[PDB]
Amino acid sequence: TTVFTRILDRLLDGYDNRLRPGLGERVTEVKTDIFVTSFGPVSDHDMEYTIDVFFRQSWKDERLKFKGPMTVLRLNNLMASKIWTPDTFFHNGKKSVAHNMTMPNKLLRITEDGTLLYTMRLTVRAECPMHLEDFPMDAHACPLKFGSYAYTRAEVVYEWTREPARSVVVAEDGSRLNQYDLLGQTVDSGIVQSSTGEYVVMTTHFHLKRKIGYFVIQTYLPCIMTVILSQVSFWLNRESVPARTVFGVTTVLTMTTLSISARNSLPKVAYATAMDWFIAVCYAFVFSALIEFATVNYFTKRGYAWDGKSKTFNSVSKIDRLSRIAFPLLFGIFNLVYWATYL
Amino acid sequence: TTVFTRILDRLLDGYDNRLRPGLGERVTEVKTDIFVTSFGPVSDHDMEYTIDVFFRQSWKDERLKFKGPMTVLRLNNLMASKIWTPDTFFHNGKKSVAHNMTMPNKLLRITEDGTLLYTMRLTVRAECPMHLEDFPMDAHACPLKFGSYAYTRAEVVYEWTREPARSVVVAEDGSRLNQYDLLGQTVDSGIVQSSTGEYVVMTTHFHLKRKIGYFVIQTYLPCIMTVILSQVSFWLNRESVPARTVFGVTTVLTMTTLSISARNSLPKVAYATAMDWFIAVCYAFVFSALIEFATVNYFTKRGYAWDGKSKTFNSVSKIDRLSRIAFPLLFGIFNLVYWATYL
């Protein structure tokens, strides 16, 4: 075991971890790949998502060549902090955790050629700005960008280990999403310019699509059936003023209860989304149905309804006959225009 | 620069930071003052308040006398931790924060005489036990007590740098309170005995008074108007049974909606506050208004109302006529008793 011990001590003799490999001589080329163990929950309220990854970085440091019986060396967590590693960070990260239980979840392997494979298990919260105008029928490409914080592209350049599509791998059971479907991913790279210089950025976009079955059964169907119910009032006789006033007013209250709860699920955004417009139209349809009856009652003459046997009786309102067709049709048209637009 | 550098290296020569100044010789006197930059939010649910302060401590250490061109030295953050400082803590603190951005928010100065001025910027969560019997018409004195955790009064005594009224200073734009007015403060000091001995305690009480205007428009006015609205049933004709039953029962449901919402704003206490009694009495009034109609309807003989051109008709109930006076008067009296008691 002496031979293994000696090599470790000799490696860091004069090694300066403040200087990148090839400083002032060439450009350090870091090869990266990611294995997504679990694509964590997405928070619409905070407009962020969690992702658990094995972040692998590979680069060459000629200062760490060695010769010995073995061809691969495993470095202790203390040894890894003693050498130079890329100062990679996530541009859109909000608060990230490098797990340290029970030991540091890192691993630094050195090959005799001088190539270093450096893996760490991370939990990352990342910013995913969302345009929620199509909510709940919206799709997003949540990004995950990383690069060197301090080194410009003249000093450190990042590349994917293999074909960009195959460099990011998502575990088969790794989808931990409730309201989204991970359709796929596109992996790209480019240059981003800031006030300090030009930096290389590696980008991965996860394309998410919101599942709508929840909002169909929680919001859309109750709203549609209450609007239909508010229109069912049109088929009652015009002489039942208390019944049609109770009918119309309580459907307004039902819309208020549905509208209030429907917006609790929505993130607290101050602009209008596709569900707000649908509820606003349903609110206007329910409001108009009670205004429709108010006009019918103004032209009602006799306070008694048809007795069922035969003295004169009120005639079926012409407002009602038209409203039994116009109101369902206008709502029907609105639904086709609404759904064809967003679907 | 050399003169400044030499003094620092010389200061800690033979210095033992584990021993307080004048150990076994006299009592170390600490003069303290506070500058409240912002009296942060107060939480009724957690019975705690936040406060951002510059906590300034002053004392004398003969071991740190120096002679040189400058009369004041600004110690580094590393240097400040190498010397003895008072072990001041907050008796009612819950979870305090010492700000470390971008550097440690601390400053330690030394005068030639050996007087140390030591300041830090803190966000303190502190315990403020609240007796909420008179809520929302309650006032509180939230304390802020501190002293030496380990050193008894025979070793370390604290005092205010100047007159106690002028030792706690609040910034003019410091009040960050939404539900309270900072009337003022009183500054005192005393002695507390515990299992480990007697200790000097420096105390500050912030006198707070709750703003009532929010609760008048949110709770008191709707509840008063709902009670008034329940009495409005007394002015309807006795023959309109469905209208006065709907009137009374839905006012009960309105009070239930208001009463439940009012509690959700209240902190989760398990005793009756002032607002609890007002809502309970309003509930009793609204309850008694529907019971009153149950009695009126029990003595109605004819199901038809007066025809407008007079066959006999029911007279206006004497229960209703007396209720038109008794109910407004009893509620008016209850309001004088309630509002005089707490205001």
Added chain:
Amino acid sequence: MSFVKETVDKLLKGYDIRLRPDFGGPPVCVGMNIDIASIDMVSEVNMDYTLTMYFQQYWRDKRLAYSGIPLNLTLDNRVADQLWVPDTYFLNDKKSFVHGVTVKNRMIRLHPDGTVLYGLRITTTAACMMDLRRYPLDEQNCTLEIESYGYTTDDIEFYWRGGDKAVTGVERIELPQFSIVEHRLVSRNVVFATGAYPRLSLSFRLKRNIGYFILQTYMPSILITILSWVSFWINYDASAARVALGITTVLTMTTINTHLRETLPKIPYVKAIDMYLMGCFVFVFLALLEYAFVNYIFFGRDVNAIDRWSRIVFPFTFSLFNLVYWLYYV
């Protein structure tokens, strides 16, 4: 790298972090610029906002001048602990941290002339006092105060590097609840009894978006109030219809206010939204109380006059209330 290694070690040999540049000389001028990454949250309850940014500081340190290398030396971020940096802090920050994955999000970059670039990625929750009386039609002015904890203007001076171009990324900021209308940079020397202290202030003017409140608060309240007026068009003898309409609208209005009391934040004082909701509640309260006057005069003790007048005064007075409300708050 042999020559560079000697040069870097040479600079830090004998370096005294405790002493500022030009110690005992002219005040060191520290230029600052900020590149805002995002404003994550703005909470009325806590009276603060969250800001993520790239915070750069520029100053000249002749102890760090180097020659012979036509390169700007970016050094491992841990060297910052070995250098002198300004004792800069944010005066109104409540909770803040430097990001630390994978390594500390910190940067030191030396330049041949001695210029030092010191950059941090900071997420800071900063205190912002808000005047929410005109909520949700309010405009807020949140700031970030940058000050030296220990030094005075005799020792250290702040300035915005690049003038009004010092702060960038504002135009790309998207907030779900606000919109950035303007931002200003202010340089000033606060004065106390002790003396003058350097100060830099970055302030944004936020104008709240109204679309959500129009559809969720104002429109339902208007429609319920208009719905309460339907009673004025119903026969006086329809007591069951007019009372059920009147009291359910009162119930609906309290349902809106109590259920939107919990969605809206806990800001416990009278705001513009409260007045409008309170005003609408009074109008529906008066509409129901109007029929009580109608019922009593007919059955107890003309009849059409009270209703005919109410069909005009209530729509008219609500318009007058709206005119006063919107003119006062807009």
Added chain:
Amino acid sequence: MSFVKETVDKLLKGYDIRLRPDFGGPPVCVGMNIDIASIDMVSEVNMDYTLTMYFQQYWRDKRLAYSGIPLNLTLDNRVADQLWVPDTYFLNDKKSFVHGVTVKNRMIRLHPDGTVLYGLRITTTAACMMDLRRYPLDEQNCTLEIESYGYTTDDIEFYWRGGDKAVTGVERIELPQFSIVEHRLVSRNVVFATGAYPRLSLSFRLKRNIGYFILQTYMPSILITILSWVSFWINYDASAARVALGITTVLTMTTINTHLRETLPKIPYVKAIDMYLMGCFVFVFLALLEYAFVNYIFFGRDVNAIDRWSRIVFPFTFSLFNLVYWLYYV
């Protein structure tokens, strides 16, 4: 002053902190007393409670005996890292910390004979498995288990210092929802697979304040239940009035029932509040269901008899239900 400095240096020279006093000899006896500063939170959602206490430990360490200094040496808390301290922990705590502003709230006081006083200020969230069958008429018993983590009873022994007076400050505690009826100190041994361990238990008995729930929860339910009986005193032919009263009280009961439960976590087993609320829900459900038979048995086919008996059976059965309920839970 140097004499004291020299004395302390001698004690820590060669001191082994990994070995307990009298290693291999008789077990070290550790005495504990607690001063409770406050109990802050007692949460049913997390099924825990928060406790701020002064935690003192006494033991004799011959290696720390000193002579010539007629004083008890209170030392800077940073010396605790250079001494052996018991590996004491709270067996049922969920998350805890020692306060650290302005410094770590830690105390080390030595005595001439070698006695060590080790005091800490600790806020600890401790697990208290609560029995909520009788809630809100429930009485809880929350404990704090103090055990050695690594050392068995062959190495370390615990005892309460001062008997039943070892815990002070309990009388001063104020809880918004409980009253401290009693507290007890127990001492025992617990046997595991790895050997026996010393145990000290501190337990409190908590009685919940019932007055608030009477006004908030029970009284409205009682009144609505009495309201549902107003239907029995209304004419059988007032179908509109009696259905509106019947269904709105059912709605009112649901309103009470729907968002009362957010005062407690989703804890699935039957509790006393659940039985009463569901008892009242069944009664209002039956009061409206009773009219279905009343209306049908007249128009569809003893109308007064059915109404007459309900005027007695419903008040009587509800009082019988209340009698059985309150006796069972009180």
Added chain:
Amino acid sequence: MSFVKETVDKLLKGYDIRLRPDFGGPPVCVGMNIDIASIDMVSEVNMDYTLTMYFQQYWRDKRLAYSGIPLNLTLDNRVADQLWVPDTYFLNDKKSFVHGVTVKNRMIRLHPDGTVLYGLRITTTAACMMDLRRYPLDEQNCTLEIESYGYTTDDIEFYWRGGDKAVTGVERIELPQFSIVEHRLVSRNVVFATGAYPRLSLSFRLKRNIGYFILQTYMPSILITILSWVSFWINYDASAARVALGITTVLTMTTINTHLRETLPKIPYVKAIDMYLMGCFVFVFLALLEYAFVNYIFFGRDVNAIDRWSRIVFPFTFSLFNLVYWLYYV
């Protein structure tokens, strides 16, 4: 104490934490056993559970063999940072920590033959992907995955020390919402392109308690749905009574449905409870529509037949819906 002090210093002198026991020889076998303290939380929103346990690792290291002391050395927890320990981690662990009050909750125990016992008190939040389609009648399988980070089976092997008895304390688990039905221990090798890695799995099966949802969710929904059938027994001409009943049950059902959405967690997809609430909403929706058809076919144009048939079909179809529902989920 000096003899043991020199014995320990002998062990560490020359120790190399960077080399595994039997380096270059056969793989070091590490036995593991867990004593479960509690499962504090199980959250569907985050899809994880919080676990407190005593995690023990047991292996043999010849370099730590000591002779002359007929005792098992229980040492201070700080000695663990100077020995070799396995690089064990939890694969599905979102956040975890070792308790640190009063000292770090860590244990090291040596034995004469070089056997090391290493215990840690860990609270961990472990990811558990849950299939909540059958919620609240769901059965969950939450696991803890134990793996080596940077060693293959050529260097380290894992096994459950004690067979199926390697995990104890499961009967101590008291989850208010679940009951532990079973637990298993699995030992396996995970083969990747880089080699084979040891794997240990501890898994629990959880059965959710349904009683709360019977009283809180299912019974109110059943009673409201039954209440909506009271309309079928009222006169066809009681329009005010039957519409008020029908429309208020719809409002009551929405109140139950919308407010249940708040007490229950934010799981955004269709579950078993959603299908039942949606089923009952459709039934009450149809009951209100049933009277409209009766009301229209009378005044707009048999009548007794529709009510008679609705008195049977509605209760019968709801019973059939329940039969299909409970068989498909129980």
